[PDB]
Design a protein around this ligand. Structure first.
Ligand code: HEC
Ligand code: HEC
Ligand code: HEC
Ligand code: HEC
Ligand code: HEC
Ligand code: HEC
Ligand code: HEC
Ligand code: HEC
Ligand code: HEC
Ligand code: HEC
Ligand code: HEC
Ligand SMILES: [Ca+2]
Ligand SMILES: [Mg+2]
Ligand SMILES: [Mg+2]
Length: 800
C-alpha cells in the first residue's frame, strides 16, 4: 500500500457492519484514486475529521401514506446561548392601498432544543487496523446505554434499515483527501446492504441540485462557491440527512433543522438561525434592514450574514429539486405526501405555536390535528399564507381529503403544485406555430409573412388567445444596434424594432390577414421612413431591409382546472376563475427583400445552460417592471419599455440583444450598470452591477461566476470576431467589444490604471468619446481566445 502522508487522494467505502450488545463497528476501506490501499491512517498527525454517524429509518403513520424518516441514535439537548438568542424585530416594507407604510414582524422562539449529531471526537482512538488500508471503527457510543431524551424513541430495532455515515478529512483538504461516504443496511438480515427501494434518499445531488450549485470543491479561485457545508467537510446528501432530522432545531431561534424545512425556507428566503460560534445566518436579508432602520444590536456587520436569497425559479417550481421523470431517486415521489414540517416550511412562514398559539386548539367540535394540521384544515387564509393567495382551508372544505393525504402512487397536493407547469407544457404543444419568412417590399413599406397556425381558427378568432406578438428587428449582419429614440410612429417608436399584435387584425388599419386553412398570411403596411441624419421610427428596418422575426403568443389558462384530461385553455374574458398566461415562442424567421434567409447571428451562450438555473423557457417580462411597464409594445414608449409583455422569449439566440446591445437609445446608464446584454448579464451574476433596477439586493449566484462554463459552451469564446463588433456606447463614453465583455467583471470603473492601460495597449478603448474605436482594432483574441496562451478557459476556474 501507500502511506497516508504520501497519498495525494483518498477514497473510502464502508462495509461489514457489526452490532453486538450495543457495540457498533464498521470497516473503512481506504484507498487512493487508483485503488491502492492507504496505510498509516491510525497514526497520522494531520487528520482534520473522522466522524461517524448512525441512524435508523422509522415509519410514520397518519391518514394516507407518510414517508419514513431518519432518527439518529446520537443526539443531545442543546441550550441556547442567551446573548445570541435572537430578539423579535419589525421592519417597514412598502405601503398599503391607502398609501400608509406596511410593517412586517419577524418572530423567534429560542429555548432548549434537540440536535442530532455524529461521533466526531474519538477519531483514531476508535480505529483498529484489520488489513492494509482497512480500518475498523468501533463506536465509543453504545446503543444500549444512550441517555433518555424526552420525546425521542432511541430503541435499537434491527428490523429497520439503518445508515452509517463517514466524514473523513486530512491535510486540510477541500476535495482530494476529503470523503463523505455511507452505507445503508438491514441488521436483521445479516447486516446486508439495503436495496435502493428499501432506504430513504428523496433527493440526489446530481439529479436535483447541481443544475444550480457548483460542486467544484477544490476551486481555489477568489469567487469559489461550491456546495460544501460546515467549514467544507460536509458535501454528501446522505451525510446531511443523519443530523438534519425532523426533530432537530436551533435553540437560538427555534428554527427547524429538518432537511426539508430548512432547504425550503433557505430557497424561499425566509430561513434564519444562529450557527457555529454564534454567527447569525439570515437568508431573508430582513435582519440587516431592521438593524439599519430601527437598530438591532444582535446583528454585527461583517460577522453575521443577513442577505436575501434570490432564487432563479419560483419557490413553487418543485421539479427544480424533486424528480418527476423517473431519472432521480427511486423514492422521488416522497414530495407528494403530507409531512407537517415540509408543508409548513412554505405555507406557514413566520408562524409558531407561541405567537400563534390559538391554532393549537381546533374550532369548537372539530378534531385536533396539531399545530400544522389545524392551520391547513382550519386557520389558513390567503391573506396570511406563506404563499400569498393560496386558500388551504377552501381545499379542506371543498377539495376532498386526497388533495393533501395521498396513498402510495397517488398525487396528493402535487395535483395543485404541478398543475400550471403541466398545463403549460401541453398548451405550448397544442398552440405550437411556425413563422415563415417575411417578404419586405421596402419601397412599398409592406411586409408579408405566413404563420403556420395549429388550426383553422385563426389567432384573432380564438378568444383563448390573449395577444399574439410578432416582433421584427433589423440585423445588419454584424450586430444589433438599438440607436437613438425617435419621435413616435404608427407602428412603434424604435429605429430597429416593430412589435405587432396579430390577434387584433380587425382593428388595426395597417394589418390584414388572409387565411388558407391553418395558414394565415399577414400583410403589414406603413413601414416607411425618410432616411437621413435624424432618428425616425423603423429607420434601420428600412435602411437595412432585413432581419429577424420572433413570435410571443399569450394563451389564457384556467387556474381552477386541475384535471389534466380536461382543456386547460379558457376564454380570456371569463370572470369566474383566475386566469394565468401561457407563453408560446417560435422559430426565429427572417425577413428580407425576397424572403431569403438572413444568416443567423452567431450563438455564443447556451440556451440549456441558462435553463439549468432559470428552468425551461424562463420569462423576463417582470424584469421590465421599472419603467413604462404598462405601455404596450406597439405603443410609443412601450415599444422598448413594455412589461405587458416584454416581446422576447429565447435567451441565447440574440432575441434579447435586439434591444440590449451597444447602442442604448436615451437616458443612458454608465458602464458599471450598463445596458449591453453581455455587460448586464455578467454584472448581475458576478455581483458587479452598481445598481439593479428592481431590487437593492445583489443576486446570490449559486455557481462561481468565473466558471464561464456555467453559461458558455466550449468553443463559444474564441473571441475571433468579437473585436469586429461595434463599441458599447454607455452614458459617459464607449467601450470596445472585448473590453466591454471582460471589464464588465474585471474593471467596471477605471479604478486600476494598469488594467485600463492593458486594454488600451492592445487595441481596446475604455470610456472614450463616441466613435473612437475602429472595428478590427482589438487584438485580444490572440492571447485570450480559448486555448491561447492566456486563454479564457485556462485563466478562469471553468468546468466544461
Ligand atoms: C451533524 C454532524 C451535521 C451534518 C453531517 C450536517 N449538518 Fe448542517 N447543521 C447541523 C447542526 C447541529 C446545525 C445547527 C447548528 C446550531 O448552531 O444550531 C446545522 C446548520 C446548518 C445550516 C445553517 C447554517 C450553518 O449553521 O452553517 C445549513 C445550511 C446546513 N446545516 C446544511 C447542511 C448540509 C446541506 C449538510 C450536508 C451536505 C449538512 N448540513 C450536514 C449539523 C449537521
Ligand atoms: C430545492 C430548492 C427544493 C424545492 C424548490 C422544493 N423542494 Fe421539497 N424538498 C427539498 C429537499 C432538500 C427536501 C428534504 C429531503 C430530505 O432528505 O428530508 C425536500 C422535502 C420535501 C417534502 C418532504 C419529503 C419527505 O420528507 O419524504 C415535501 C412534501 C416537499 N419537499 C414538497 C415540495 C413541494 C410541493 C415543492 C414545490 C411547491 C418543493 N418541495 C420544492 C428541496 C426542494
Ligand atoms: C414550497 C416549496 C411549498 C411546499 C414545501 C409546499 N407547498 Fe403547497 N403550494 C406552494 C405554492 C407555490 C402553491 C401555489 C401553486 C400555484 O400554482 O399557484 C401551493 C399550493 C398549495 C395548495 C393549493 C391551494 C389553493 O389552490 O388555494 C395546496 C392544497 C397545497 N399547496 C398543499 C400543500 C401540502 C399539503 C404541502 C406538504 C405536502 C405543501 N403544500 C408543501 C408551495 C409549497
Ligand atoms: C391540505 C390542504 C389538507 C387537506 C385537504 C386535508 N388535510 Fe388533513 N392534514 C393536513 C396536514 C398538513 C396535516 C398535519 C400533518 C402533520 O404531520 O403534522 C393533517 C393532519 C391530518 C390528520 C392527522 C394524521 C396525519 O395524517 O398526520 C388527519 C387524521 C387528517 N389530517 C384528516 C383529514 C381529513 C379526514 C381530511 C378531509 C376531510 C383532510 N385531512 C384534508 C393537510 C390537509
Ligand atoms: C445559476 C448558476 C444561473 C445561471 C446558469 C444563470 N442564471 Fe441568471 N440568475 C441567477 C440568479 C440566482 C439570479 C438572481 C435572481 C433574482 O431574482 O434576483 C439571476 C438573474 C438573472 C437575470 C436578472 C433578472 C432580474 O433582475 O429581473 C437575468 C436577465 C438572467 N439571470 C439571465 C440569465 C441568462 C440569459 C443566463 C444564461 C446565459 C443565466 N441567467 C444563467 C442564476 C443563474
Ligand atoms: C426592447 C424591446 C427589449 C427587449 C427585446 C428586451 N429588453 Fe430588457 N430592457 C429593455 C429596456 C428599455 C429596459 C429598461 C428598464 C425598463 O423597465 O424598461 C430593460 C431592462 C432589463 C433588465 C434590467 C436589469 C437591471 O438593470 O438590473 C433586465 C434584467 C432585462 N431587461 C432582461 C432582458 C432579457 C433577459 C431579455 C430577453 C428575454 C430582454 N431584457 C429583452 C428593453 C428590452
Ligand atoms: C427604445 C427605442 C426606447 C423607447 C421608444 C423609449 N425608451 Fe426610455 N429607455 C430606453 C433604454 C434602452 C433605456 C435604458 C438606458 C440604459 O443605458 O440602461 C431607457 C431609459 C428610460 C428611463 C430611465 C429609467 C430606466 O429604466 O433606465 C426613462 C425615465 C425612460 N426611458 C422614459 C421613456 C419615455 C417617457 C419614453 C416615451 C416618450 C421612452 N423612454 C421611450 C429605450 C427607449
Ligand atoms: C436553483 C433553482 C437551485 C436549485 C435547484 C438548488 N438550489 Fe440551493 N441555493 C440556490 C441559491 C440561489 C442559494 C443561495 C446562494 C448560494 O449558493 O448559497 C442556494 C443556497 C443553498 C444552501 C445554503 C448554502 C450556504 O449558505 O452555505 C443550501 C444548503 C442549498 N442551497 C442546498 C440545496 C440542495 C440540497 C439542493 C438540491 C435538493 C439545492 N440547493 C437546489 C439555488 C438552488
Ligand atoms: C451567465 C451568468 C454567464 C457567465 C457565468 C459568463 N458569461 Fe459571458 N456572456 C453571457 C451572456 C448572456 C453573453 C451575451 C450573449 C449574446 O448572445 O451576446 C456573454 C458574452 C460573453 C463574451 C462575448 C462573446 C462574443 O460575443 O464573442 C465574452 C468574451 C464572455 N461572455 C466572456 C465570459 C467569460 C471569460 C466568463 C468566465 C469568466 C463568462 N463570460 C461567464 C453570460 C455569461
Ligand atoms: C466575470 C463573469 C468575468 C468575466 C466576464 C471575465 N472574467 Fe476574468 N476573471 C474573473 C474572476 C473572478 C477572476 C479571478 C479568478 C481567480 O483565480 O481568483 C478572473 C481572472 C482572470 C485572469 C487571471 C489573471 C489574473 O487576474 O491574475 C485573466 C487573465 C482573466 N481573468 C482574463 C479575462 C478576459 C480576457 C476576459 C474577457 C474575454 C475575462 N477575464 C472576463 C471574472 C471574470
Ligand atoms: C498577449 C500579448 C495579450 C494580449 C494581446 C491581450 N492580453 Fe490581456 N492579459 C495578458 C497577460 C499576460 C495578462 C496577465 C495574466 C496574469 O496572470 O498575470 C492579461 C490580463 C488580462 C486581464 C486580467 C486583468 C486583471 O484584472 O488583472 C484582462 C481582463 C485582460 N487581460 C483583457 C484583455 C483585453 C480586453 C485585451 C484586448 C484589448 C487583451 N487583454 C489583450 C495578455 C494579453
Ligand atoms: Ca445554534
Ligand atoms: Mg386590419
Ligand atoms: Mg419597462
Amino acid at each position: 500500500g501507500l502511506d497516508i502522508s504520501q497519498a495525494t487522494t483518498l477514497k473510502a467505502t464502508l462495509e461489514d457492519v457489526k452490532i453486538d450488545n450495543g457495540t457498533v463497528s464498521v470497516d473503512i476501506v481506504l484507498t487512493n484514486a487508483n485503488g491502492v490501499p492507504v496505510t498509516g491512517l491510525e497514526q497520522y498527525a494531520q487528520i482534520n475529521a473522522i466522524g461517524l454517524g448512525i441512524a435508523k429509518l422509522t415509519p410514520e403513520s397518519g391518514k394516507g401514506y407518510k414517508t419514513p424518516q431518519w432518527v439518529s441514535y446520537i443526539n443531545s439537548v442543546k441550550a441556547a446561548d442567551p446573548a445570541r438568542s435572537l430578539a423579535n424585530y419589525s421592519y417597514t416594507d412598502g405601503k398599503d392601498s391607502a398609501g400608509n407604510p406596511i410593517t412586517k414582524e419577524v418572530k423567534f422562539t429560542p429555548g432548549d432544543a434537540i440536535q442530532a449529531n455524529i461521533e466526531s471526537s474519538c477519531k483514531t482512538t476508535c480505529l483498529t487496523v484489520v488489513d492494509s488500508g482497512v480500518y475498523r471503527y468501533t463506536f465509543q457510543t453504545n446503543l444500549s446505554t444512550l441517555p433518555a431524551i424526552e420525546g425521542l424513541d432511541l430503541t435499537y430495532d434491527p428490523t429497520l434499515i439503518h445508515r452509517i455515515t463517514l466524514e473523513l478529512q486530512t491535510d486540510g483538504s477541500k476535495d482530494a483527501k476529503l470523503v463523505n461516504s455511507h452505507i445503508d443496511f438491514l441488521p436483521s438480515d445479516n447486516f446486508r446492504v439495503a436495496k435502493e427501494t428499501e432506504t430513504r434518499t428523496v433527493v440526489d445531488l446530481e439529479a436535483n441540485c447541481i443544475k444550480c450549485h457548483s460542486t467544484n470543491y477544490s476551486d481555489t479561485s477568489s469567487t469559489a462557491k461550491p456546495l460544501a457545508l460546515h467549514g467544507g467537510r460536509r458535501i454528501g446528501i446522505a451525510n446531511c440527512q443523519v443530523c438534519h432530522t425532523s426533530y432537530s432545531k436551533d435553540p437560538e431561534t427555534g428554527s427547524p433543522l429538518d432537511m426539508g424545512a430548512m432547504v425550503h425556507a433557505i430557497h424561499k428566503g425566509t430561513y434564519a438561525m444562529v450557527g457555529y460560534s454564534g454567527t447569525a445566518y439570515d437568508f431573508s436579508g430582513t435582519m440587516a434592514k431592521a438593524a439599519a432602520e430601527s437598530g438591532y444590536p444582535q446583528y454585527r456587520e461583517g460577522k453575521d450574514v443577513s442577505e436575501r436569497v434570490t432564487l432563479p425559479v419560483s419557490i413553487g417550481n418543485c421539479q427544480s429539486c424533486h424528480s418527476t421523470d423517473d431519472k432521480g431517486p427511486v423514492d422521488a415521489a416522497s414530495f407528494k405526501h403530507h409531512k407537517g414540517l415540509a408543508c409548513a416550511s412554505c405555507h406557514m412562514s413566520g408562524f409558531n405555536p407561541v405567537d400563534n398559539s390559538e391554532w393549537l386548539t381546533p374550532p369548537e367540535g372539530q378534531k385536533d390535528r396539531g399545530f400544522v394540521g389545524n392551520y391547513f384544515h382550519y386557520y389558513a387564509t390567503p391573506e396570511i399564507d406563506g404563499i400569498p393567495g393560496v386558500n388551504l382551508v377552501h381545499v379542506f372544505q371543498n377539495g376532498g381529503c386526497a388533495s393533501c393525504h395521498a396513498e402510495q402512487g397517488e398525487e396528493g397536493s402535487a395535483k395543485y403544485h404541478l398543475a400550471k407547469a403541466n398545463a403549460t407544457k401541453l398548451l405550448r404543444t397544442e398552440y405550437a406555430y411556425k413563422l415563415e419568412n417575411g417578404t419586405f417590399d421596402v419601397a412599398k413599406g409592406e411586409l408579408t409573412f405566413t404563420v403556420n397556425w395549429h388550426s383553422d381558427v385563426a389567432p384573432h378568432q380564438d378568444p383563448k388567445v390573449k395577444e399574439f406578438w410578432v416582433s421584427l428587428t433589423a440585423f445588419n449582419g454584424t450586430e444589433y444596434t438599438m440607436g437613438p429614440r425617435p419621435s413616435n410612429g404608427t407602428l412603434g417608436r424604435s429605429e430597429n424594432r416593430i412589435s405587432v399584435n396579430l390577434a387584433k387584425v380587425e382593428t388595426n388599419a395597417n394589418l390584414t390577414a388572409v387565411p388558407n386553412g391553418s395558414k394565415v398570411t399577414y400583410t403589414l403596411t406603413g413601414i416607411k421612413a425618410v432616411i437621413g441624419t435624424s432618428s425616425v421610427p423603423y429607420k434601420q428596418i428600412v435602411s437595412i431591409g432585413k432581419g429577424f422575426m420572433d413570435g410571443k403568443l399569450l394563451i389564457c389558462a384556467n387556474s381552477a382546472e386541475l384535471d389534466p384530461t380536461m382543456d386547460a385553455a379558457i376564454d380570456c374574458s371569463n370572470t369566474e376563475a383566475p386566469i394565468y398566461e401561457v407563453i408560446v415562442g417560435s422559430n426565429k424567421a427572417s425577413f428580407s427583400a425576397d424572403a431569403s434567409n438572413v444568416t443567423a447571428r452567431s450563438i455564443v451562450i447556451s440556451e440549456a445552460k441558462c435553463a439549468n438555473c432559470h428552468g425551461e423557457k424562463a420569462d423576463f417580462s417582470a424584469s421590465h417592471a421599472l419603467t413604462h411597464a404598462a405601455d404596450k409594445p406597439d405603443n410609443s414608449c412601450g415599444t422598448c419599455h413594455s412589461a405587458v409583455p416584454n416581446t422576447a422569449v429565447a435567451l441565447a439566440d440574440g432575441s434579447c440583444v435586439a434591444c440590449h446591445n451597444g447602442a442604448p437609445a436615451h437616458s443612458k446608464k454608465p458602464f458599471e450598470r450598463g445596458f449591453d446584454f453581455k455587460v448586464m448579464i455578467h454584472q448581475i451574476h458576478a455581483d458587479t452591477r452598481s445598481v439593479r433596477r428592481l431590487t437593492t439586493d445583489a443576486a446570490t449566484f449559486p455557481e462561481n461566476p468565473a466558471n464561464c462554463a456555467a453559461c458558455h459552451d466550449k468553443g463559444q469564446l474564441s473571441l475571433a470576431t468579437l473585436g469586429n463588433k461595434p463599441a458599447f456606447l454607455a452614458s459617459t463614453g464607449e467601450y470596445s467589444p472585448t473590453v466591454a465583455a471582460c471589464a464588465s467583471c474585471h474593471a467596471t470603473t477605471a479604478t486600476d490604471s494598469a488594467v485600463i492601460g492593458h486594454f488600451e495597449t492592445n487595441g481596446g478603448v475604455y470610456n472614450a468619446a463616441a466613435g473612437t474605436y475602429t472595428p478590427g482594432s482589438e487584438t485580444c483574441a490572440t492571447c485570450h481566445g480559448e486555448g491561447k496562451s492566456f486563454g479564457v478557459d485556462k485563466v478562469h476556474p471553468v468546468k466544461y
